[PDB]
C-alpha cells in the first residue's frame, strides 16, 4: 500500500480494530426493525 495507496473514501474507517471478541467492545446482536403491531393505549379519563 505504500507504493499503490488504497482508494480514499470518507466512509472507510480511519482506525482499524482487531477482533474485539471477549472485550466490552464486542458485537451483541439485536433486531434492527421497529415494533410491528402497536398496542392500544387506554384512555386516561374515567367514565
Amino acid at each position: 500500500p505504500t507504493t499503490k495507496p488504497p482508494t480514499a473514501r470518507k466512509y472507510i474507517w480511519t482506525n482499524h480494530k482487531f477482533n474485539v471478541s471477549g472485550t466490552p467492545q464486542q458485537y451483541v446482536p439485536y433486531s434492527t426493525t421497529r415494533k410491528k403491531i402497536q398496542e392500544w393505549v387506554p384512555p386516561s379519563t374515567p367514565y
Binding site: 410491528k36 402497536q38 398496542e39 367514565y47
Partner: protein, 684 residues
C-alpha cells in the same frame, strides 16, 4: 352449432365466434399475452399472442382472431416462436433495468414470458427512452418508464370502473399512458389496476418494497370489510400480513376486490387489543391475566339473569362466536342478543331466510333486464355488487332505476326520485316505471339494508314487498325480492336468531352488556343504568373498548378460521393467516372459557364441535360456497301485509354519498392509516 378446429392437430369442438386463444386454452395451451384480459375488451396491440395458422402465410392475433372451422392452430411452430421472440425483443428494447428495484420482480409476466418465449440476450445497442412519472393518487405508485402500453388499465377503468380518466397521449414511441392533466384516479376499484398491469408500472404504494412474491405465504380467506364476502388471498411472510390479493370466484367478485378490502390490512397492526384489561380502583383500564378478567365476567354473569344480561354483536363477528355467545346468554335465560344493524322485525322477520337475503344472487344480476335500487349506494356499500351491475348494464343493456339521492354509481340510471312515496306510486301502478317492471321478463328489485336503518324501515320493506308481489302476480323461479346488506356479520346473526337491532336493549336496559366487537356506538353508557357492567370482546379498541369494564382481546378475520355469510346467504370460511397478537384468543374460545368458569359450560371444546352446534341452530352455516334455494316469498308478503306502517316524508339519503364516506366504515378501516391518507386525498 359447435364448429371443429385443430390445436396442434388435436381436434376440439368450439362455439362459433370463439377466438384462437380460447380454442388453444380448451386443449390446455396458454398462449403468451400482455394486452389480452378475459374480463376486458379485446385490444390486440401487444402482439405477443401471434400464432401461425397452418397453410396461412400470415400470423394472426390469437387474442382477437375468431376461429374458422377446419383451422389447425400451430402453437409451437417456428413461425410462432419467431413472432414471440421478436415481440418480446421489441417489448424489452426500451424496458428499464429496474428488475432488482421493481416490485413486480419475481411475479412479473414480462420476466416469465421473456424466460419462456423470448430470447436470452439483447441486440439493442441504442439508448432507452425515459418517461416522466405521473401521480394518479395515494394508492397506485406509478413508474411509467416500465409501461409497455398494453392499455389494460385504460380499458379496466373505462369498463369495470366507469372512470374515463386514463388514456394514451401522443403517438409513436412517445405515447404515454395516464391522465393528461394532474388528476387523481379516484375509484373504489382503483386498486385492481395494480393487479391487471403485467409490468411493475402500476404498483401498490403501501406494499412498496416490503416483500418479494416468492417468500410470501399465501392463505386463502374471505373478506369481511363489506357484505359481498369477496374471496381474497392473505399473503403473509414470517407471521405478518404483507398484502391482500383477490381470489377468483366467478359468482361473487370475479377477479376484483374493493380498495378498502385491498388496503385495510394495515389497520390490523394498529390500536390492537393484546392483553385482557380490567378497571382498577382509579377507574382506569389496567392489564391483567385471563384468570382475573374471566373470573370477574363469570361472577357478573352468575349475579344477574334474564333480561338484565344483554349482548351487542359487532360488524366483523364470526358465526362461531355468535353461536357461542347465544348459547352462553341462553344459559342465563337471556334472549337479548342484538346486532347493530336494524332490520324490520315486524311480520315474517328473521324467520324465512329469503326475507333478508339477496335471493337473486350476485351472479343473477347478469340475467336481469330491469333493476330497481331502493335507498342504497351500491358503489360504496357493496362495490363488487355495483361492479356486477355495471357489467350487466354494459353487456346486457340492464335498465337501472334508483330511488334515493342522486348519487353517482359510475353508470347511467333512471333517477325516479328520493321520496319513499314513489314506492307507493310504483306499487299502485301510478308511476310509469310500474309498466316497465311489468314488461321486464326477469325484473330485480334491490333494497339497501342502510335504508332499513331509518325509523320507517318496516314501511319501506312493506312497500318494496308490495312492488315485488305486484310484479309476481302481474307477470321460472326468478327471485325478485332482494336486500343488499352492508355488514359481514348481519346475515349470520339473523340466521342464528339474533335480534336485528338494539331496540330490545333500549326497551329493556340491561345490567350486563357484552359488547362483542361492537364499535358502532349505538348504545352508550348514557342509555344504560348508571352501574351497567360492560365487557368488550374485540380486536381493535375504537369505540366500545373505552366504554367497557373488562376487555377481552379477540381475534381478527385474518387470525382465525371463521364462518361469514355474505349478502346473498352464501356461507364461507376464512383460514388462519397469522396468530392473534399478545394474549388475544379466538372469540369462541374466549366465550367457552368464560362459560366454563361461570359453571354453565358450553357443549363444545373444538372448532369442529362449534360448527356442529352451528348446524343444530341452522344447517346452512356449514355448507360453504352453496347458495341454498329458498323462495318462501308469498308467506313473507302476507305477513308484512298484516302491519301497515306509514312511509315518512324524509328523503332516501344513503349514509355514504361520496368517496370520502367509503374508506373509513369499520374499526379496521378506521385504525388504518392508508384509509386516512385516502380520505385526506379525496377530501382535499
Amino acid at each position: 352449432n359447435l364448429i371443429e378446429v385443430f390445436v396442434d392437430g388435436q381436434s376440439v369442438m368450439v362455439e362459433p365466434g370463439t377466438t384462437v386463444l380460447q380454442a388453444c386454452e380448451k386443449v390446455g395451451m396458454q398462449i403468451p399475452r400482455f394486452c389480452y384480459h378475459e374480463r376486458l375488451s379485446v385490444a390486440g396491440n401487444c402482439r405477443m399472442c401471434l400464432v401461425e395458422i397452418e397453410k396461412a402465410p400470415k400470423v394472426v392475433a390469437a387474442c382477437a382472431m375468431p376461429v374458422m372451422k377446419g383451422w389447425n392452430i400451430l402453437t409451437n411452430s417456428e413461425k410462432s416462436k419467431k413472432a414471440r421472440e421478436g415481440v418480446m425483443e421489441f417489448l424489452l428494447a426500451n424496458h428499464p433495468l429496474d428488475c432488482p428495484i421493481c416490485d413486480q420482480g419475481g411475479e412479473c409476466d414480462l420476466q416469465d414470458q421473456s424466460m419462456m418465449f423470448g430470447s436470452d440476450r439483447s441486440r439493442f445497442l441504442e439508448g432507452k427512452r425515459a418517461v416522466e412519472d405521473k401521480n394518479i393518487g395515494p394508492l397506485v405508485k406509478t413508474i411509467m418508464t416500465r409501461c409497455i402500453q398494453c392499455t389494460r388499465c385504460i380499458r379496466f377503468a373505462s369498463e369495470i370502473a366507469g372512470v374515463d380518466d386514463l388514456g394514451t397521449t401522443g403517438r409513436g414511441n412517445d405515447m404515454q399512458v395516464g391522465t393528461y392533466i394532474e388528476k387523481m384516479f379516484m375509484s373504489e376499484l382503483s386498486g385492481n389496476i395494480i393487479d391487471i398491469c403485467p409490468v411493475g408500472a402500476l404498483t401498490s404504494k403501501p406494499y412498496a418494497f416490503t416483500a418479494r412474491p416468492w417468500e410470501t405465504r399465501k392463505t386463502e380467506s374471505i373478506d369481511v370489510m363489506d357484505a359481498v364476502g369477496s374471496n381474497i388471498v392473505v399473503s403473509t411472510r414470517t407471521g405478518e400480513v404483507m398484502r391482500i390479493l383477490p381470489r377468483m370466484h366467478e359468482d361473487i367478485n370475479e377477479e376484483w376486490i374493493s380498495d378498502k378490502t385491498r388496503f385495510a390490512y394495515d389497520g390490523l397492526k394498529r390500536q390492537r387489543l393484546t392483553q385482557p384489561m380490567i378497571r382498577n380502583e382509579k377507574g382506569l383500564l389496567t392489564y391483567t391475566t385471563w384468570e382475573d378478567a374471566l373470573s370477574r365476567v363469570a361472577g357478573m354473569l352468575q349475579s344477574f339473569q334474564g333480561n338484565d344480561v344483554a349482548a351487542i354483536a359487532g360488524g366483523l363477528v364470526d358465526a362461531e362466536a355468535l353461536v357461542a355467545l347465544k348459547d352462553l346468554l341462553n344459559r342465563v335465560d337471556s334472549d337479548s342478543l342484538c346486532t347493530e344493524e336494524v332490520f324490520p322485525t315486524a311480520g315474517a322477520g328473521t324467520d324465512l331466510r329469503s326475507n333478508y337475503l339477496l335471493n337473486t344472487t350476485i351472479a343473477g344480476v347478469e340475467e336481469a333486464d330491469v333493476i330497481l335500487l331502493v335507498g342504497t349506494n351500491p358503489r360504496f356499500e357493496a362495490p363488487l355488487f355495483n361492479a356486477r351491475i355495471r357489467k350487466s348494464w354494459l353487456h346486457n343493456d340492464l335498465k337501472v332505476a334508483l330511488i334515493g339521492s342522486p348519487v353517482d354509481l359510475t353508470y347511467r340510471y333512471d333517477h325516479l326520485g328520493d321520496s319513499p312515496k314513489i314506492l307507493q306510486d310504483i306499487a299502485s301502478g301510478n308511476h310509469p316505471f310500474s309498466q316497465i317492471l311489468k314488461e321486464a321478463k326477469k325484473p330485480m328489485v334491490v333494497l339497501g339494508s342502510s335504508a332499513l336503518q331509518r325509523s320507517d324501515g318496516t314501511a319501506i320493506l312493506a312497500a318494496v314487498s308490495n312492488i315485488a308481489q305486484n310484479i309476481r302476480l302481474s307477470s321460472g323461479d326468478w327471485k325478485v325480492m332482494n336486500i343488499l346488506h352492508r355488514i359481514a356479520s348481519q346475515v349470520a346473526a339473523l340466521d342464528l336468531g339474533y335480534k336485528p337491532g338494539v331496540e330490545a336493549i333500549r326497551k329493556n336496559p340491561p345490567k350486563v352488556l357484552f359488547l362483542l366487537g361492537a364499535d358502532g356506538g349505538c348504545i352508550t353508557r348514557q342509555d344504560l343504568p348508571k352501574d351497567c357492567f360492560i365487557i368488550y370482546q374485540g380486536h381493535h379498541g375504537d369505540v366500545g373498548a373505552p366504554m367497557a369494564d373488562v376487555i377481552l382481546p379477540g381475534a381478527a378475520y385474518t387470525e382465525k378460521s371463521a364462518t361469514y355469510v355474505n349478502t346473498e346467504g352464501r356461507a364461507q370460511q376464512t383460514k388462519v393467516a397469522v396468530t392473534p397478537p399478545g394474549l388475544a384468543r379466538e372469540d369462541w374460545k374466549i366465550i367457552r372459557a368464560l362459560s366454563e368458569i361461570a359453571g354453565m359450560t358450553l357443549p363444545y371444546d373444538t372448532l369442529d364441535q362449534v360448527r356442529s352446534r352451528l348446524e343444530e341452530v341452522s344447517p346452512n352455516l356449514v355448507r360453504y360456497d352453496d347458495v341454498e334455494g329458498a323462495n318462501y316469498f308469498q308467506q313473507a308478503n302476507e305477513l308484512s301485509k298484516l302491519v301497515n306502517q306509514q312511509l315518512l316524508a324524509d328523503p332516501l339519503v344513503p349514509p355514504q354519498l361520496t368517496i370520502k364516506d367509503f374508506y373509513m366504515t369499520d374499526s379496521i378501516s378506521r385504525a388504518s392509516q392508508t384509509m386516512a391518507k385516502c380520505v385526506k386525498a379525496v377530501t382535499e
